[PDB]
From a paper:
For multiple rounds of initiation to occur, the GDP on eIF2 has to be exchanged for GTP. This reaction is catalysed by a guanine nucleotide exchange factor (GEF) eIF2B. Here we have determined a cryoEM structure of eIF2B in complex with the GDP-bound form of eIF2 phosphorylated at Ser51 on the α subunit, which sheds light on the molecular interactions between the two molecules and provides a basis for understanding the regulation of translation by eIF2α phosphorylation. The structure consists of two eIF2 molecules bound to opposite sides of the eIF2B hetero-decamer.
To improve resolution in this region, we combined particles from both datasets and carried out 3D EM data classification applying a twofold C2 symmetry and using masks around eIF2 molecules in the complex. This classification resulted in map 2 with slightly lower overall resolution 4.3 Å, however, the local resolution for eIF2γ and eIF2α-D3 was better compared to map 1. In a low-resolution filtered map 2 contoured at lower threshold, we could see weak densities around eIF2γ, which cannot be attributed to this subunit (blue and red masks). Each eIF2 molecule has two spatially separated interactions with the eIF2B hetero-decamer—one through eIF2α-D1 inserted in the pocket between eIF2B α and δ subunits and another contact of eIF2γ with the catalytic eIF2B subunits. Another contact is formed by eIF2γ and eIF2β interacting with the catalytic eIF2B subunits γ and ε. Although eIF2α-D1 containing the phosphorylated Ser51 is relatively constrained through its interaction with eIF2B, the domains eIF2 γ and β in the proximity of the catalytic portion of eIF2B have relatively high conformational heterogeneity presumably arising from high mobility and do not adopt the same conformation in two eIF2 molecules bound on either side of eIF2B.
Numbering used by the authors:
A (entry chain B), C (entry chain A): 4 to 305
B (entry chain C): 10 to 108, 113 to 128, 147 to 376
Write the structure that this text describes.
C-alpha cells in the first residue's frame, strides 16, 4: 500500500500539514486497513514500514521521532485492558485528531510566545520553523513593534526563502551573511532559532550554522531562543560536537582536481550543547533546561 | 466576575486591594498570609453546593487580584497552590461517583491519554497546611544549607532585606565550629536602612561585619568565597526577583570571578509564572530620594528601580524547606505544587 | 598625469607586485616628473592626489597606509641636511627599490613562517593574502605534510577562488561554509588568517567573517594566525566592534519590497580585538601583540 509514496505526494501542499504530522497521518492510514485487532500481524509490519522509511531517508530526523510517539500512543490505548474494539476505534480516530492537534498547539504558542518580544526589539532570526514564523506573524497581528535581521543560511538557500516570506508580511528586513554574523551582535536585542530536533541532553539538532550562533551569543551575553512544536523529541544523545546520524558525508577530503567538481562537502547538520540555549518554547508550557529529558522520561517510562 | 456579590458578606477583599495599591502591606510573607485569610473567609462564608462553578469563580478572583497588584506574586502563588490541592481531590472524587489509574509515576503529558462529600473540609485543612508551611521554612533550609560553607570563608551579601536569609545566617553563626566574614553591599536608594539594621544584628550576635559601598564590590571579588541572595520571587527558568537594589551587578561580578552564588527561598515564594521580560516584571522606585530641588529636576531625569532581576546563568542552588535544587531542575518542584492550567487565571 | 588611471591599468597583472606596492610605485612616478626639489609646489599636489585617491576608493584601506610610508621616506631623505640633488636622486631610486623589497621580504617570510606548520597538521585557512599562500606553497616546496580546509568567504565568492588556487598546487581540500565553521574546530590543528590591515591597538582589519573565526577559536583554544607583508599599518584605532571607514552601507534596513532587489546589505569589513590573535608573522621578525604599535610609534615619532 506504501507509506514513502504517500509522503512524496505532499509537494505543493505542506505548511498546514507539518512534515512529521503528515508522516503520522500516513502511519494511521496504513494501520487501519489490515485490521488493528491483531498485535503480531500489524505492529511487526508497522515496524518494517518505519525501517523501510529510515532506509529511504537522506537528511531528515523528525520522521523517526514522530513514529515513536505514535507507537507509544498505540500501546497506551489498551493499557486499561478495555474492549478490543472501542480501544481500536479510538486509535484509528486519533490520526485525524493528531493533525487537528497541530492547529490547536499553534493557536496556543502564538499567544504565549509573543510575550518574549518586548517593546521595540531588533531580532536576528536563524533557520525556518513553522512555530517561530507564526510567532512573528501573530505579533504583527497583535500590532507590536519589532525589527528583523535575516541570516544567510546555506542548505538549499534558506536565507533568501526566509527573506521573501518576510516581504509578504510587511516587516523591514536586510540580508546578513553567516560569516559576518559576529559583527551584528550589538545592534541585536535577541537571537531566535527554529530546530529540526531537540536532544535528550537538552541540546539542539539544527542546520548548517547554529552552534556558531549559539557560542557567539554566549560571548555577547545576548539571549538565544529555540521555538518549536512539541513532537520533535528523539531518544538521541549526540555525545560530541561533531557526531550525528548521516547518509552522506561526515567531512570528506578529496584528491587533486582540475575540472572542479568535488568541493562542497561540509557538515550540513550541527549540534550545540545545553548551556547555549537561554530559552525554549513549545505548547507544553514555557520550559527550557532539564524539561526536554523529563518529557522523554515520562513518554518512554525508562 | 465582579465584587458585587461579595460586598456585605465579604468586606476584606477591598481592604487588601487598598493595602496593595497604596503599599500599606509589606513583604511577600505578609501578602501570602492575608490571601490565605481571604480564602479562609471565602470558603467559611459562601454557599455553593456545586464544585466546577466554585473553582472557576476562585480563578476569576485570583485573576482580579493579580491585575490589582503585579508584584504580589506570593498572592498569586498561594491561590494557585490551593487551586491544585482542590483539583486533585475533585479528580479523586469523580472516580468514585462514576463507579489502570496508576501507570508508573506522577507525570504530565495532558496531550496524550484522555480522561455530598467532605471536600470542603479538605479545602479547609489545605489552607491550614499552607500556613504551617509558611510558618516553618527555616527548619527545612538549615539542614541542607549549613553543610556548604567553610571556616575562614568570606561571604558577600546583596539584599539584606530578607528575614529568611538573616535567620539562616544566625543559625550557622550559632555553630561555634563555623567562622565566616560577612560583606554587605549597601544598596543605596532603597536598601540602606535595612542594610544598616542587618549590620547591627550581625554585631549583636558578634559576627565579623563589613559594610560595603556599591562601588567597591569589584575591589573585593578576588577575596570573596561565596555570594548569597535574599530573593523575593523565584521563577521557572531559575531566575529571581529580589528585594531591591544592587544584586544584578554583584552576580555579574561573581560570575566573572567564578565565585559561587547561593539563593535562599520558599516554595510559596517560588512561582510557576515565566519572566519573558524583565521590563514588565520589575517595579521602579521614587527618584525623590536621590536628588532634591524640582527646577533642576526638569533637566535631571533620574532613573531608579526597586526590584532587581538575576538571570539563571549565575546562581547554582535554591535551598528551600524541601532541599537544595539546581536552576535547571526547579521547574519540576514548581509543577509538583501547581498545575499547568492554573497559570493563566 | 594621473595616479588613479595608473592603478586601474593593473587588471590582468597583479601578484608578487602587491596592490599597495603598485600604488607606491605610482606615487614615485608622479613625483619624479614635476621636480621633487620644491617642497611647496610638490608636496601639496601629492596631498591633493592622495585625497583624490581616497575619494575614488570604494572598499580599500591599504592604499592610505602605503601613501604614509612613502611620505615618511621622502621627509627622512633630507634629514641629514645633504645635497639637495643627491638626496633627490636617492628618493626617485627608492621607488623601484621599494617594489624590489616586496620580493626580498617574501623570500624572508616563506623561510621563517614555514616553521609554524608542524609535522602533519590540519589547517583551516580564511581570508586570502599573498604572504599566507606563499607560506603554503613554499612549505610544499620544503616537502612537509599539511592538510587544508577551505572557508566559504562571501565578498565576491572568494572561497571558490581560493579552492581553485589550491588545486593548482597538489594539496587535498574540501569546502567548508562559514556558517558551519564552528563545527570544524576540533579536527583543525591551527587557523590561519591573512589581513587587509593591522590596527594601532593590535587588532585586525579584515573581510566578511574573521572576528567570528577569532572568537570561536578563542573558545576552542585553537591557535589563530595573522600573516602579512609589512606595509599594512595605519594610524587607525577602531574603538568599537562595528566602526570602520566606509564608502557604502553601515547596516541598512530597507522598506517593504515585492520584486526583491534591496537585500544583501551587511558589514563587508569586520574588526577583531587584540586578544584573539595568538601569533603574527611579518618580515620584521617574529612578533605579535604590542609590536605593531611600537612600529607605528617608531614611524610617526609621536
Amino acid at each position: 500500500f506504501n507509506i514513502t509514496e504517500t509522503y512524496l505526494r505532499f509537494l505543493e501542499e505542506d505548511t498546514e500539514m507539518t512534515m512529521p504530522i503528515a508522516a503520522i497521518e500516513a502511519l494511521v492510514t496504513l494501520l487501519r486497513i489490515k485490521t488493528p485487532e491483531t498485535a503480531a500481524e500489524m505492529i511487526n509490519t508497522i515496524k518494517s514500514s518505519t525501517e523501510e522509511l529510515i532506509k529511504s531517508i537522506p537528511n531528515s530526523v523528525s520522521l523517526r521521532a514522530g513514529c515513536d510517539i505514535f507507537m507509544r500512543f498505540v500501546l497506551r490505548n489498551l493499557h486499561l485492558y478495555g474492549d478490543w474494539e472501542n480501544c481500536k476505534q479510538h486509535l484509528i480516530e486519533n490520526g485525524q485528531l493528531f493533525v487537528s492537534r497541530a492547529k490547536k498547539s499553534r493557536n496556543k504558542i502564538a499567544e504565549i510566545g509573543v510575550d518574549f518580544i518586548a517593546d521595540d526589539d531588533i531580532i536576528l532570526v536563524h533557520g525556518y520553523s513553522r512555530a517561530v514564523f507564526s510567532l512573528l506573524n501573530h505579533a504583527a497581528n497583535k500590532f507590536i513593534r519589532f525589527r528583523c535581521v535575516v541570516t544567510e543560511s546555506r542548505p538549499s538557500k534558506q536565507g533568501n526563502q526566509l527573506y521573501t516570506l518576510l516581504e509578504q508580511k510587511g516587516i523591514p528586513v536586510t540580508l546578513i551573511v553567516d560569516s559576518a554574523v559576529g559583527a551584528v551582535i550589538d545592534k541585536v536585542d535577541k537571537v531566535f532559532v527554529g530546530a529540526e530536533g531537540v536532544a535528550e541532553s537538552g541540546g539542539i539538532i539544527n542546520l548548517v550554522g547554529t552552534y556558531s550562533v549559539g557560542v557567539l551569543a554566549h560571548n555577547a551575553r545576548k539571549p538565544f531562543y529555540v521555538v518549536t512544536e512539541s513532537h520533535k523529541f528523539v531518544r538521541m544523545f549526540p555525545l560530541s560536537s561533531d557526531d550525528l546520524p548521516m547518509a552522506g558525508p561526515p567531512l570528506d577530503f578529496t584528491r587533486r582536481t582540475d575540472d572542479l567538481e568535488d568541493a562542497l562537502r561540509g557538515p550540513t547538520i550541527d549540534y550545540t550543547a545545553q548551556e547555549y540555549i537561554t530559552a525554549l518554547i513549545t505548547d507544553l508550557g514555557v520550559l527550557t533546561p532539564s524539561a526536554v529529558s523529563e518529557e522523554l522520561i515520562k513518554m518512554w517510562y525508562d | 466576575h465582579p465584587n458585587a456579590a461579595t460586598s456585605d458578606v465579604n468586606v476584606t477583599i477591598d481592604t487588601f486591594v487598598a493595602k496593595l495599591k497604596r503599599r500599606q502591606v509589606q513583604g511577600s510573607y505578609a501578602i501570602a498570609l492575608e490571601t490565605l485569610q481571604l480564602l479562609m473567609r471565602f470558603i467559611s462564608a459562601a454557599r455553593w453546593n456545586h464544585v466546577n462553578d466554585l473553582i472557576e469563580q476562585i480563578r476569576d478572583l485570583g485573576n482580579s487580584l493579580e491585575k490589582a497588584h503585579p508584584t504580589a506574586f506570593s498572592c498569586g502563588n498561594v491561590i494557585r497552590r490551593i487551586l491544585a490541592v482542590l483539583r486533585d481531590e475533585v479528580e479523586e472524587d469523580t472516580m468514585s461517583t462514576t463507579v489502570v489509574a496508576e501507570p508508573l509515576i506522577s507525570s504530565m503529558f495532558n496531550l496524550l491519554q484522555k480522561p455530598k462529600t467532605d471536600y470542603r473540609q479538605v479545602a479547609i485543612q489545605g489552607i491550614k497546611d499552607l500556613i504551617d508551611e509558611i510558618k516553618n521554612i527555616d527548619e527545612g533550609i538549615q539542614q541542607i544549607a549549613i553543610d556548604l560553607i567553610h571556616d575562614h570563608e568570606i561571604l558577600l551579601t546583596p539584599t539584606p532585606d530578607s528575614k529568611t536569609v538573616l535567620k539562616f545566617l544566625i543559625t550557622a553563626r550559632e555553630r561555634s565550629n563555623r567562622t565566616f566574614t560577612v560583606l554587605v553591599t549597601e544598596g543605596f536608594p532603597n536598601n540602606t536602612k535595612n542594610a544598616h539594621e542587618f549590620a547591627k544584628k550581625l554585631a549583636q550576635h558578634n559576627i565579623e561585619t563589613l559594610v560595603v559601598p556599591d562601588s567597591a564590590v569589584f575591589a573585593l571579588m578576588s577575596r570573596v568565597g561565596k555570594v548569597i541572595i535574599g530573593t523575593k520571587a523565584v521563577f521557572v527558568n531559575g531566575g529571581t526577583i529580589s528585594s531591591n537594589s544592587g544584586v544584578s551587578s554583584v552576580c555579574e561580578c561573581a560570575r566573572e570571578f567564578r565565585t559561587p552564588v547561593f539563593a535562599v527561598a520558599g516554595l510559596y515564594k517560588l512561582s510557576p509564572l515565566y519572566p519573558f521580560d524583565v521590563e514588565k516584571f520589575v517595579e521602579f522606585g521614587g527618584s525623590q530620594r536621590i536628588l532634591p530641588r524640582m527646577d533642576p529636576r526638569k533637566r535631571l531625569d533620574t532613573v531608579n528601580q526597586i526590584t532587581d532581576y538575576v538571570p539563571p546563568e549565575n546562581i547554582d542552588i535554591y535551598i528551600t524547606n524541601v532541599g537544595g535544587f539546581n536552576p535547571s531542575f526547579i521547574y519540576r518542584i514548581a509543577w509538583d505544587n501547581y498545575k499547568q492550567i492554573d497559570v493563566h487565571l
